[PDB]
């Protein structure tokens, strides 16, 4: 009764939900045909799958997932791949023409035909969850269905469910290497729905994950699998206290309390510490004090922001494997000695620890070495206000010559949203500077 329904929006959302969900089949016992082979003579004791998987009478487990796309070519690979009996046939929603790198198509014209069907499979997957923690949102800021329709997905979910948790994991655009031109018109105009209609918000950039996977692992020339695989190792470690036993257990409600001071202010940074290769797992001991301080490194963050520019508001550690409470508490005190990490004037306590038991699961065909410890850390920092400042520049640069604007205002999208949802960002960029300034 610790359920979470995942919602995957877009080709970024779908292809992340192919790599999250082959992790959760191997993490538990479930195969691609749905059966749990260890269910015979050992049953009832393993209630760990109940967060993500749903049982039928035949011993077949069906996920709590909804895959959404506005193009047919992405989900049709999922519909006939290896995992084609794992997913219910009606949980994979597809349109006929995509939103085509355009906010207003996926919001005002083309997304109006799928919101009536998707919002009915959400009701059927939340009328069997007796206690639902909250939804999970996997989308991309830059596409058309990932940005246009998610802003219309979230806006109904405020009304439809009220005050349940709506966590989001997004792909904010990279500040240097992008794969679009109309990218900043989308990413600006969806800030006003990740501001109101999100309860927490995690914004990784795929250029930062390229830096880690080239350097910390040894995959020169990686593809999008090795990026999806690392994102799955964070969503599991956030929810690993909902399924396996822990000395200290922290829930999705419980770090919401301990990370967001004010409800305008919910944008932390995700950093998963031991990402090393199998050859360089031979040469490195991987103790508790040695991975708890690689989270804080400005070369391992998965957003292209440096936390030395700003002040930590709160932090949330998530230890896993063979740790001890005596040593989690021993290496937190080291971080507080150094000036190079500094906390804010009004947060004297600072942290929230969580200690799990079951160590993380290696994936065959994967790349990370099989280790015995890990850390996942979700810190809230004033130095995230630079990442919207390297994209403030590229909206008004293109908008001052009024380029590409006929592709939006001919879709039934009014003109005043450009001058407003940017001046929306002209106060959330000034909100973050004042909530860090030293007291009078």
């Amino acid at each position: 009764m610790r359920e979470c329904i995942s919602i995957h929006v877009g080709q970024a959302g779908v292809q992340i939900g192919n790599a999250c969900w082959e992790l959760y089949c191997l993490e538990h016992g479930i195969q691609p045909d749905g059966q749990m082979p260890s269910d015979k003579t050992i049953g009832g004791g393993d209630d760990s799958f109940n967060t993500f998987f749903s049982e039928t009478g035949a011993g077949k487990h069906v996920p709590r997932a909804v895959f959404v796309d506005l193009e047919p070519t992405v989900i049709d690979e999922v519909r006939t791949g290896t995992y084609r009996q794992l997913f219910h046939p009606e949980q994979l929603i597809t349109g006929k023409e995509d939103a085509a790198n355009n906010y207003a198509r996926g919001h005002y014209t083309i997304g109006k035909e799928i919101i009536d069907l998707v919002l009915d499979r959400i009701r059927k997957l939340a009328d069997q969850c007796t206690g639902l923690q909250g939804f999970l949102v996997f989308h991309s800021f830059g596409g058309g269905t990932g940005s246009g329709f998610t802003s219309l997905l979230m806006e109904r979910l405020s009304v439809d469910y009220g005050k349940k948790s709506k966590l989001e994991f997004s792909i904010y655009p990279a500040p240097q290497v992008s794969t679009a031109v109309v990218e900043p018109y989308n990413s600006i105009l969806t800030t006003h729905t990740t501001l109101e209609h999100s309860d927490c918000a995690f914004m990784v950039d795929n250029e930062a994950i390229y830096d880690i996977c080239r350097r910390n692992l040894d995959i020169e020339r990686p593809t999008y699998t090795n990026l999806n695989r690392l994102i799955g190792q964070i969503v599991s470690s956030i929810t690993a206290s909902l399924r396996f036993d822990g000395a200290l257990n922290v829930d999705l409600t419980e770090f919401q309390t301990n990370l967001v001071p004010y409800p305008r202010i919910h944008f932390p940074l995700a950093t998963y510490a031991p990402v090393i290769s199998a050859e360089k797992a031979y040469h490195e001991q991987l103790s508790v004090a040695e991975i708890t301080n690689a989270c804080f490194e400005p070369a391992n963050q998965m957003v292209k922001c440096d936390p030395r520019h700003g002040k930590y508001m709160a932090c949330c550690l998530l230890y896993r494997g063979d740790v001890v409470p005596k040593d989690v508490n021993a290496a937190i005190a080291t971080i507080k000695t150094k000036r190079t990490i500094q906390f804010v004037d009004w947060c004297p306590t600072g942290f929230k620890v969580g200690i799990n038991y079951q160590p993380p699961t290696v994936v065959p065909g994967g790349d990370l070495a099989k280790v015995q410890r890990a850390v996942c850390m979700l810190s809230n920092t004033t130095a995230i206000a630079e990442a919207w400042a390297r994209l403030d520049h590229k909206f008004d640069l293109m908008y001052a010559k009024r380029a590409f604007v006929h592709w939006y205002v001919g879709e039934g999208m009014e003109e005043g949203e450009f001058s407003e949802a940017r001046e929306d960002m002209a106060a959330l960029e000034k909100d973050y500077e004042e909530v860090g300034v030293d007291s009078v």
Binding site: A281, Y282, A369, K370, Q372
Partner: protein, 54 residues
Amino acid sequence: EFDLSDPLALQKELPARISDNDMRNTISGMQKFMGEDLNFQERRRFQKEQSREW
């Protein structure tokens, strides 16, 4: 009550834990603790062997 005022009661006495395998060291007698580790070194050694083979 001569035993309270023996001149040699300190000689004619036993410590509360002669060795780690002694019978009178229970939970309520707070000489024996659970988190002392004598299996520490062997467990660390087999951890290193397991790491090497992985």
